Amino acid sequence: NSTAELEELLMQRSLTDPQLQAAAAAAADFRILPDATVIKIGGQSVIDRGRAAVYPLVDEIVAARKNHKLLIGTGAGTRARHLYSIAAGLGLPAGVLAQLGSSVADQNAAMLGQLLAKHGIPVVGGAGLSAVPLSLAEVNAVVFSGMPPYKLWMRPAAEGVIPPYRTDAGCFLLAEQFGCKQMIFVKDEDGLYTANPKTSKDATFIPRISVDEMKAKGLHDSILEFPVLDLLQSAQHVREVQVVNGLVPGNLTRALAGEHVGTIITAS
Amino acid sequence: NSTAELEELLMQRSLTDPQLQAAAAAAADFRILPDATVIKIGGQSVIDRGRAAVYPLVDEIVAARKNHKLLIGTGAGTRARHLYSIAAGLGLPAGVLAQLGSSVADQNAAMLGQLLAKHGIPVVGGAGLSAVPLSLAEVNAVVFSGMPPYKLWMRPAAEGVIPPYRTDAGCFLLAEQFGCKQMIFVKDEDGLYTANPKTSKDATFIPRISVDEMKAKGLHDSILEFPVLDLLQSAQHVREVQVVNGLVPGNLTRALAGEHVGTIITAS
Amino acid sequence: NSTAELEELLMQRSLTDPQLQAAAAAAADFRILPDATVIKIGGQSVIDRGRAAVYPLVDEIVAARKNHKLLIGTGAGTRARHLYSIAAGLGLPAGVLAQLGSSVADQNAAMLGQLLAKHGIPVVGGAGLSAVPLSLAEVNAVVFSGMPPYKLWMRPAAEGVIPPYRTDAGCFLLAEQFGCKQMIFVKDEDGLYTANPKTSKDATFIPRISVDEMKAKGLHDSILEFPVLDLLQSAQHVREVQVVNGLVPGNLTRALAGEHVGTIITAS
Amino acid sequence: GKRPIRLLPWLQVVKIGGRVMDRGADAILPLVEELRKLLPEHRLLILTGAGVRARHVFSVGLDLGLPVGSLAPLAASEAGQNGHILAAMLASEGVSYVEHPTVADQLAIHLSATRAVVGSAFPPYHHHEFPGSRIPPHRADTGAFLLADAFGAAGLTIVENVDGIYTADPNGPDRGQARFLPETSATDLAKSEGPLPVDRALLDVMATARHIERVQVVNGLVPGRLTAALRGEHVGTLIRTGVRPA
Amino acid sequence: GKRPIRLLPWLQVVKIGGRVMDRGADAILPLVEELRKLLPEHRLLILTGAGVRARHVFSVGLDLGLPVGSLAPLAASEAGQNGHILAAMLASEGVSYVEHPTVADQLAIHLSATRAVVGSAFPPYHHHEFPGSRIPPHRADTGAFLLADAFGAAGLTIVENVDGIYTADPNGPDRGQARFLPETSATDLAKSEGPLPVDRALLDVMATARHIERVQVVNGLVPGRLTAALRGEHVGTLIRTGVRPA
Amino acid sequence: GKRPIRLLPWLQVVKIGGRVMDRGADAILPLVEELRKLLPEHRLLILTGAGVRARHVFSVGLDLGLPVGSLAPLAASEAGQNGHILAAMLASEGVSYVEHPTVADQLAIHLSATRAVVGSAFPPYHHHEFPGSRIPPHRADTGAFLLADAFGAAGLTIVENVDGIYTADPNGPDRGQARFLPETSATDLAKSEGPLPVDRALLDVMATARHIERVQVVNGLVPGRLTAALRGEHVGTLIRTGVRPA
């Protein structure tokens, strides 16, 4: 039995053994929440902007949950960057900064959660297996905070103390682990451009691109946390992501309906 | 932008600054749970009395949740007053007594919760944003314990160590914070009288009264915790409360239907 | 009032007083979850066996929750027996072993819970009063871990350090405390035999038997933890249990439909 | 006897009866001053019982028809309130109340940090309480002994509002018939019928005990008796558990 | 005055302003080195305020229309982040951040284990914050005093980014008119209108205080002033609470 | 190198392999007695790995088709059980098991209260484990190093059931070819293919390390080698992380 030989390797070898690794790779693949979509609501790009950005997006979430299962994660934003600057100036390590940034994404989940409470949509911990709300047509959505749980065990970047895995990575890994069908990043620009559209006056819009092409074009750290692009190339379930402008009325609704608004980034 | 000038004041002034306070007062007003009613079930007046009082009220809660969203908080009662007397005789401060009384309201929420479990109604922490049960027609109600969370940070009364903010205040503040439409106190008397009806033989019933009129008539500490009357005058959302007799069959049902049973106490 | 005399005894006597004990025994009997069925999924007999055993049982749970309220508890299995052997060889007491075994039943609840998440069925703590899922037709079931909470306060057996109250007892006591209508143990044999069917070649099947008859026939510690048989004789609500083979397709479904598959063990 | 190791062999466990606490400052203040003087002498786990408030919640819960597993945590809450009260009076000495999980897995570090901790004597049986009686059987005395024996503690002392065990309730109807028992065995008590000042389930868990050979019940209303009992002096009723010394 | 007992009479409570923390290493590093030298001298409960990040979350929350009970825990989060930052800088001395529940019931054992702990100065009013203002009234100064007075602590010292209380905002429009107040009473401040460096609710809870007779506001940007204030030296503004000495 | 400060520079971190624990009393009892003698010499954070029970839960979880983020917490549970077992054997010395949150933010106070604490070496990646392999990559060795380097600890020592790192599995098919490596660099190991006694992810986090310059893998089945390694003696395989000394 390949099942038998896998268990022999699992008992007799180190988990570093390539033969064991290869046998585990042949295991079946169960998707835990295959019909859900994970959405990240940007901290700096959306929630920090207040009612003019958040209220229309609340309306879209309420309308969209009628036909789409939603896992809605929150970014952190300007208060996290303030905390990072204080802590970095004290010489504190990335693992300590990681814990501080989590509190800010938590704040944002709380505020969004209180606007959605009367619509039945709760705030849950990380929330993959918040199985009851995502199975009820009256609810069909949850809100969670987007920071990964690594905290003091955050792996640092090659340089600096800014945690490299933030809300983009936290939301993406949730979609990947639960085998969700779709991952949508909600930011404040129409999508990926050839340069930062805020600081370059003739950047060109990019509707569709691969991770390798992004790296080759020199924009590995552009609209998404650059570790997300590497996680995307390793993913088993979520092999592409879409980035859309949450400041455009109805943009999230149209993305959920399958319209190619924004930029689609593919693993290959 | 008044939004711009508010954020300038928020960055540049102490939060004690009257100019900042006045600009914050002009902010918009969001109600989190506008269609819910908060009900307090008295500890001494109801739950301490056992089946003859509690069982009919359970029946009314089950029937009422069909057309009314309910947040049901529990009082404390005789076991809390025993704890207060022990702790006060030891010279312990109001903050320590506050923690002890909370356990008793928790006990009562547990007992009520087990009678309601087969009807789908859960016991939740404080429970404003227990958004899923209050959005399902099969549930539409939750039970919580009525003690405020102040614990050791309880502000003492001017004299004595009895915590001044108990289950009445805890339930009222929940209704006020979530902008609920209605606050009903369920006790063991028909309403407010001109004197304590248990120790005076010709007290007169009062169907409707303001906080100022209660204070002027000398009954600031009568059927409700007297700090509740001051909280009521400061409230933004809940500007009146109704006190009804839970020992009268159907009295809570009729109050929810808009019948003027009991006493209505107005902020002004 | 028998209610009055009970409260006199409750105030004036030790709880050891036979007169107080007898008056408490006359109290009314409320069933908290009378329409639920508690099911134990064996650790060693089912979950340890992987997809071939677990996947069909997941299908039966999903189909059965359409007409039957389910509390589904998990056993522990081979990883717990490994932990017991390590700890026992170190001279650790039953209370320490009890805590270790709980983690393994928790693991199993997690795995089963992730297979059921897309069907709306959550993993809850112990879960009697998980009132919302068990009241919704879209859910109507929960998963919990079967270990009792005694931990370091586990009463040891008369000999040895193996905790005598494990997942069988934990699941049974849940059914008894919430006054459930039915308790079904899902194992890997058709039911009780006159001897262990794995180590005796002509054991005879027993369709129905009392606790006293099991003890007299010499099989007090056979297909169930032997303390369960004593708990069964003391139970107020669950006066019989059924043991069925979870490896037989549809066996749990047919037991829930009232078919006399397996063995029925009666308190008297 | 090939018995399990002793986890905390230097520990002394003291169980304070909830009805002692019920007497308020008049009983608690002398007890607190005696405990203060004992802190430099012993490493103490002080566990509180429930007392009269549990009787009231039993009265309401039994009136509501609740099962024994519902009543157990309601009573346990009152034991924990008594523990918070006692710990508050000893806070200036470094004593705090610790929760069941801390008691179960982190007692060692806490008794390294300070000389004594207070916890609840009720065990976490809660809704997994055994059926049979409508009164929860595994109460304060039983939980305190289960803990002390599991730890392999040096002793367990039970602090009562009476001198010890009598042949009848010394505050009850048959009180002129009640005779003091200086010593007894758990097996002898278990085969008697009648009320006791200790849980009947205490006698059952003494039958399966691994370490504790004797438990003394002493009157906590007499200053000095707890101090003497913690030195092995016979000032109350000694209960022999049936664990044999080596 | 038949007042309640003092739970932790040997305790000194220090409240660090969130806007002090906002200044980063330039203010925090000298403060940390002063706290290090104070550890062998005092048993310290160090509580942090919120500062500017709470102003930003108030800006967003007020823009969203959220009520005052929603804003209170959002601000409290920033005080706890400041506490985690400060405790991290003192970790090598044995100092850690402790949560509200630990502060409330287990402070005694933790101050037996180490010389100082850090916590949040915001009180857990959260969604039970009082209505009236759209700005949460029970902030860091208020929570720190409620704790210190409930414990019966030896003192509370408030560490500010200014010398003390002035007759106007010394960083505001009327700043050439602002005169330093070496001493004041809480009642005199409460009957004035104008901004203060301390919560107005602090003045209210001083009116019902049971133990703390004076609170000093000192400039934490001047090294040595916190050290001097903890010895009773007058280096800032003394606030008389109205508790009378016996 | 303008690197972050050291939070706990006096700390020594020891990682005990789960397969060492799997050997039961025969390995655990000598290790416990060696740890007892080390308590007065070092301030120890002892972290346990998972061992064979995680292989079984991987076998079931992989059979059920579960993703790598599902398997990670299931394996972490077994590391925590090993930690509870080890801490139980050291309880009489004041050692207890502490949870990840306590380790992350309150290690300082706990190591002020007692000489050593035990925790789990698995990091809380759980369902945010990285995809790619079906086996969770961030295991015990990796979590122990991330913690030790984040704290700026004086060292990390990895206690194995073999002498150190060989050029092949010394218990595997190519075992007569396996040659002992007294020293190696993390970069040299990472560019090899073949099994190792340490996580491959350990080599990756050593590449970004800020403080720890070397990690020694020693045979915990030989009494005295852990003691010697904690004094810097070369009794196993030294792994150079690539952090350069100043």
Ligand SMILES: Nc1ncnc2c1ncn2[C@@H]1O[C@H](COP(=O)(O)OP(=O)(O)OP(=O)(O)O)[C@@H](O)[C@H]1O
């Ligand atoms: N090539 C590019 N194309 C588009 N946007 C780019 C590019 N390079 C940089 N950006 C910037 O990336 C920003 C999005 O990242 P940002 O961190 O602001 O998002 P966020 O999800 O709101 O973050 P957080 O949630 O952490 O606050 C855009 O506002 C844009 O200015």
Ligand SMILES: Nc1ncnc2c1ncn2[C@@H]1O[C@H](COP(=O)(O)OP(=O)(O)OP(=O)(O)O)[C@@H](O)[C@H]1O
């Ligand atoms: N003027 C008055 N009119 C009516 N009732 C009054 C008046 N003055 C005093 N009371 C008393 O107030 C009581 C209600 O307060 P009580 O504290 O008993 O209520 P409760 O909500 O059950 O309290 P808890 O929940 O804290 O146990 C009534 O039983 C009544 O005797």
Ligand SMILES: Nc1ncnc2c1ncn2[C@@H]1O[C@H](COP(=O)(O)OP(=O)(O)OP(=O)(O)O)[C@@H](O)[C@H]1O
């Ligand atoms: N007389 C008997 N009749 C039937 N089975 C018996 C008998 N005596 C012993 N057994 C054994 O009892 C086993 C069931 O107990 P087991 O502990 O394996 O169940 P489980 O519920 O899976 O346990 P856990 O959940 O603790 O892993 C059967 O596999 C069978 O071999």
Ligand SMILES: Nc1ncnc2c1ncn2[C@@H]1O[C@H](COP(=O)(O)OP(=O)(O)OP(=O)(O)O)[C@@H](O)[C@H]1O
């Ligand atoms: N045989 C007996 N010997 C002594 N006291 C007895 C006996 N039978 C009954 N009692 C009574 O038991 C009383 C003590 O009550 P109880 O044991 O419930 O208190 P407690 O131990 O303080 O409570 P808790 O168990 O909640 O901690 C004594 O005051 C006495 O009246």
Ligand SMILES: Nc1ncnc2c1ncn2[C@@H]1O[C@H](COP(=O)(O)OP(=O)(O)OP(=O)(O)O)[C@@H](O)[C@H]1O
């Ligand atoms: N009358 C006054 N006297 C002194 N400072 C005043 C006065 N009125 C306003 N202020 C201002 O208050 C500022 C301090 O702000 P604030 O009190 O909000 O800070 P903080 O205490 O650090 O914050 P937090 O309350 O979050 O801990 C001073 O720098 C000063 O400009």
Ligand SMILES: Nc1ncnc2c1ncn2[C@@H]1O[C@H](COP(=O)(O)OP(=O)(O)OP(=O)(O)O)[C@@H](O)[C@H]1O
């Ligand atoms: N190159 C190698 N050098 C040494 N041992 C190796 C090598 N490759 C494989 N091994 C094997 O690794 C075994 C140790 O297994 P493993 O690393 O999984 O244990 P562990 O560290 O105790 O487990 P855990 O990671 O759960 O704490 C050794 O006994 C040896 O057989």
Ligand SMILES: [Cl-]
């Ligand atoms: Cl690996």
Ligand SMILES: [Cl-]
């Ligand atoms: Cl103010």
Ligand SMILES: [Cl-]
């Ligand atoms: Cl009894």
Ligand SMILES: [Mg+2]
């Ligand atoms: Mg007793």
Ligand SMILES: [Mg+2]
């Ligand atoms: Mg200030």
Ligand SMILES: [Mg+2]
């Ligand atoms: Mg290894």
